[PDB]
Design an enzyme around this catalytic site. Structure first.
Site, PDB file in Angstrom:
ATOM      1  N   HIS B  88       0.871  -1.202   0.000  1.00  0.00           N
ATOM      2  CA  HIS B  88       0.000   0.000   0.000  1.00  0.00           C
ATOM      3  C   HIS B  88       0.895   1.236   0.000  1.00  0.00           C
ATOM      4  O   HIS B  88       2.120   1.146   0.111  1.00  0.00           O
ATOM      5  CB  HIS B  88      -0.909  -0.007   1.241  1.00  0.00           C
ATOM      6  N   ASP B  91      -1.269   8.664  -1.376  1.00  0.00           N
ATOM      7  CA  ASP B  91      -1.242   9.859  -2.262  1.00  0.00           C
ATOM      8  C   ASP B  91      -2.160  10.896  -1.615  1.00  0.00           C
ATOM      9  O   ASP B  91      -3.365  10.687  -1.530  1.00  0.00           O
ATOM     10  CB  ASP B  91      -1.745   9.422  -3.639  1.00  0.00           C
ATOM     11  N   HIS B 128      -5.688   8.971  -0.884  1.00  0.00           N
ATOM     12  CA  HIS B 128      -6.043   7.595  -1.232  1.00  0.00           C
ATOM     13  C   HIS B 128      -4.798   6.757  -1.402  1.00  0.00           C
ATOM     14  O   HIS B 128      -3.726   7.272  -1.670  1.00  0.00           O
ATOM     15  CB  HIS B 128      -6.977   7.555  -2.472  1.00  0.00           C
ATOM     16  N   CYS B 129      -4.974   5.447  -1.367  1.00  0.00           N
ATOM     17  CA  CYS B 129      -3.875   4.549  -1.701  1.00  0.00           C
ATOM     18  C   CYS B 129      -3.528   4.653  -3.175  1.00  0.00           C
ATOM     19  O   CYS B 129      -4.388   4.906  -3.996  1.00  0.00           O
ATOM     20  CB  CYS B 129      -4.231   3.148  -1.302  1.00  0.00           C
ATOM     21  N   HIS B 138      -7.338  -0.518  -5.425  1.00  0.00           N
ATOM     22  CA  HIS B 138      -7.216  -0.139  -4.013  1.00  0.00           C
ATOM     23  C   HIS B 138      -8.177   0.995  -3.618  1.00  0.00           C
ATOM     24  O   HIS B 138      -8.818   0.968  -2.543  1.00  0.00           O
ATOM     25  CB  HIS B 138      -5.767   0.200  -3.679  1.00  0.00           C
ATOM     26  N   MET B 143      -9.923   2.489  -0.025  1.00  0.00           N
ATOM     27  CA  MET B 143      -8.751   3.209   0.521  1.00  0.00           C
ATOM     28  C   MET B 143      -8.736   4.683   0.135  1.00  0.00           C
ATOM     29  O   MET B 143      -7.947   5.104  -0.684  1.00  0.00           O
ATOM     30  CB  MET B 143      -7.429   2.545   0.135  1.00  0.00           C
TER      31      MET B 143
HETATM   32 CU   LIG Z   1      -3.702   0.029  -0.907  1.00  0.00          CU
HETATM   33 ZN   LIG Z   2      -5.726  10.955  -6.636  1.00  0.00          ZN
END
Ligand SMILES: [Cu+2]
Ligand SMILES: [Zn+2]
Ligand SMILES: [Cu+2]
Ligand SMILES: [Cu+2]
Ligand SMILES: [Zn+2]
Ligand SMILES: [Zn+2]
Ligand SMILES: [Zn+2]
Ligand SMILES: [Zn+2]
Ligand SMILES: [Zn+2]
Ligand SMILES: [Zn+2]
Ligand SMILES: [Zn+2]
Ligand SMILES: [Zn+2]
Lengths: 335, 335, 335
Positions: B88, B91, B128-129, B138, B143
């Site tokens: 993971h 961002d 988010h991931c 993901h 996420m």
């Molecule tokens: Cu992830």
């Molecule tokens: Zn983004």
């Protein structure tokens, strides 16, 4: 009025570049002459050899960006060579009357026409083909681009302070509707006409098979990445003639954005993701502060990563730890 | 600069609550330290026992909302326990460079990392991931969450007058892509990895099976309704990391709304329905004037009522007949 | 307060017209009384005889536009004749409390009810049916229209200068979900109730079969085209109660647009294409400068040309060569 003005001739360049131009200018209004030649051609649009029976202005998706200043007249010669099969035309969203010019630019193969219109409003505007009875097919097959009409004194922020860019890039995003056969593989057609019926059936599902920047999956990646450097302000022009999109710069921002693309309105600042309505072009400015390879993408991540609506920008310069620092690199969880 | 500032540690709370914080503050910039722990888990997402092989920050969809002030530094420790199967990352749309931090927070199971970034722009921002090659999966598996960066002098209306909220709630809307078997029933998977291939096929149709607030159909209804009282101003933070949504308060309004979520821009007033672009978070303020049970929903009513994108807000207080009165109750048509 | 005001009674007119009203007014607040009668009926919606088991306010899709001024009270009598099969109600997005009025206007066949609410915010607002458990079906079957609440001193531009229209038209755009049989032809149902189950299945795909202005493909074309003349400013009110749309005037502009529809916010100028969020109504002003037949359409061109979301405006007057001139008509390419 137009008959007493000087003329100028502009040579267009291929996307993602935009032809040289001034932002703020001391020049008065001119008749700005352009020519475009339509090219129908089969294009490979993805990494597994899928083909599109495409239609283009000037051989490219999108067509080239045309740049003038507010109060100029655009005078376009549209040429449809006899090697093409279909009639074409042009609808400029920046133009007043005659269905954007389309009624006055209906060219069969072997013909050309010349249209003049006053560019009386500033902004980025979509232009696209619009032949009677065939409009959506020509547009989704690749016939769109941007006319940018700059304010004569350049871009301005909401308080009327000057804004500028050092480099401009033009991104045309294309929702494609490629049919499949009974085996589940994409169909390859021998001619443009043979693709029509099956393509219309896919169109009516409203579900694109691919969504690409500038004509193909990965068009703006690798050797063809956009480029910039720390301290440079880039203008990203984004057109979508048929379907909504939501641009985003990963690790960046839209410092100043005209999501509806019309420069007499104040821009918004600090955007993470902005919104380009289908049938429009918008514009974002960003000043790079970190080096590295950025992604510029449609933030429906399925559209971006699965369907193709993503590109890269490779940025040179010095890393700024004040803005972002890896305090502790990935390492085992302490126990 | 960051190395000379005081540090503070914030304890996160589960959505739909947001951790205690100040709006306008006399404090100067700080390094604000947070920790999140990723949890992969199977979750029941509807009333008929459909399950999602989910991935979460801190065990919840959405992840918790992180609140700082403009000019603070966010310092996140991201922990990926050895009980998880996948790598993971994070961002942050509020962060500059390194793909929002994702390049610096790539954690395999059994690892953790610490990232610091300057929160230099006010607004609500999605995080988010974003692991290499697996980003959309993901994100749509759960996420994502919100970073809110408040202006140091609090929220302001278009004329620069102060705005405030008395209570904040965070709503994360999740477009889910649950596969079906040959019998037409939703598939249940033994492991996260086994869900991948079938889920990607559903994703590519662009048609969600479910669209839920905060992890499940009805998450914000019954005992888990949001609450307020007449006279109270609520902030509704709404994030959608992948797909557009159109929030609406039935019987209310967005009194002041930043639909693009960026507080340095003037808000709009009096909205019936506002628009959150996929890949963003926005913010609405509303001051309740009538008691009762409101619905807060995505106003594609099919998405809301059929697919799950709706919650309730139960409001205490005194009914105002000036604002609305039943003049004649339902009764037979006079003849 | 409301009990001491004068009452007025307004007679509604069928779309696309809007009942006569003042823009800026010297009148003080009034209780403005309206009546609407629900009609369920089978309607032919396309050129190949496809039918919709429809539900309407006042026999039309959309329902009539109701016009008041800010600070007026709207007092609606909603009548559900005994010839109808279903219960109905009304949710006004312009109203505060009781689920927009829906909790107070629940009328079974053979009943009527009277609701009063203060129209305290200016703008165009959607109203729609919202009966418990059946909301999306009633809305997509045709039960929506617009309430326009004008500022008491008329419309204003961003600098506070007066704006006006000479003629108003109301366009309701309807995403329809018509089921098909095993032969691939659209199903015709004997009764409204028999259409329900199959329609819900189509709704859940999120893919409309048709998208129409004002109740049918071509409703606003031919003899039923909208009309204007060079120099006239038209207000185009556009409502979409369930799904996003992107209006566009081909060969024109949105001179001043409130895409979110709320008149206390400054409008945007010079738009090529604007955006109406599902669950809202917006408003555009345009002053015609060229004669001819314009198209007014949703600029997802597939939605417009394939699915039905397009109309015409036939404009009288004198052609302006300054704005646009055919320099060279289509002719053979010189060799
Ligand atoms: Cu992830
Ligand atoms: Zn983004
Ligand atoms: Cu063409
Ligand atoms: Cu109804
Ligand atoms: Zn000349
Ligand atoms: Zn510069
Ligand atoms: Zn167009
Ligand atoms: Zn320190
Ligand atoms: Zn308060
Ligand atoms: Zn009275
Ligand atoms: Zn006028
Ligand atoms: Zn509604």
């Amino acid at each position: 009025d137009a008959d007493k003005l000087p003329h100028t001739k502009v040579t267009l360049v291929a996307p993602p570049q935009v032809h040289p131009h001034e932002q703020a200018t001391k020049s008065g209004p001119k008749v700005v002459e352009f020519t475009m030649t339509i090219e129908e051609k089969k294009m490979v649009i993805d990494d597994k050899g899928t083909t599109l029976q495409a239609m283009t202005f000037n051989g490219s998706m999108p067509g080239p960006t045309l740049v003038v200043h507010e109060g100029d007249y655009v005078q376009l010669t549209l040429v449809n060579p006899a090697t093409n099969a279909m009639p074409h035309s042009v609808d400029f969203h920046g133009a007043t009357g005659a269905l954007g010019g389309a009624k006055l630019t209906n060219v069969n193969p072997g013909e050309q026409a010349t249209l003049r219109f006053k560019a009386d409003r500033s902004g980025t505007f979509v232009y696209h083909c619009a032949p009677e009875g065939m409009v959506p097919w020509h547009v989704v097959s690749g016939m769109s681009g941007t006319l940018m009409v700059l304010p004569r004194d350049g871009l301005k922020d909401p308080q009327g302070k000057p804004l500028h860019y050092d480099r401009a890039y033009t991104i045309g995003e294309f929702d494609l509707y490629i049919p499949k056969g009974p085996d589940g593989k994409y169909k390859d057609y021998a001619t443009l006409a043979e693709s029509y019926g099956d393509t219309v059936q896919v169109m009516r599902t409203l579900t694109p098979s691919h969504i690409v920047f500038n004509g193909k999956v990965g068009a703006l990646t690798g050797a063809n990445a956009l480029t910039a450097k720390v301290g440079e302000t880039v203008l990203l022009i984004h057109s979508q003639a048929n379907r909504d999109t939501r641009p985003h710069l990963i690790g960046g921002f839209g410092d100043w954005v005209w999501e509806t693309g019309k420069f007499a309105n104040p821009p918004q600042r600090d955007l993470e993701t902005w919104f380009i309505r289908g049938g429009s072009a918008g514009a974002a400015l960003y000043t790079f502060k970190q080096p590295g390879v950025y992604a510029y993408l449609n933030h429906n991540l399925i559209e971006a990563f699965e369907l193709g609506a993503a590109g890269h920008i490779k940025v040179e310069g010095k890393w700024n730890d004040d803005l972002m620092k890896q305090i502790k690199a990935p390492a085992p969880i302490p126990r």
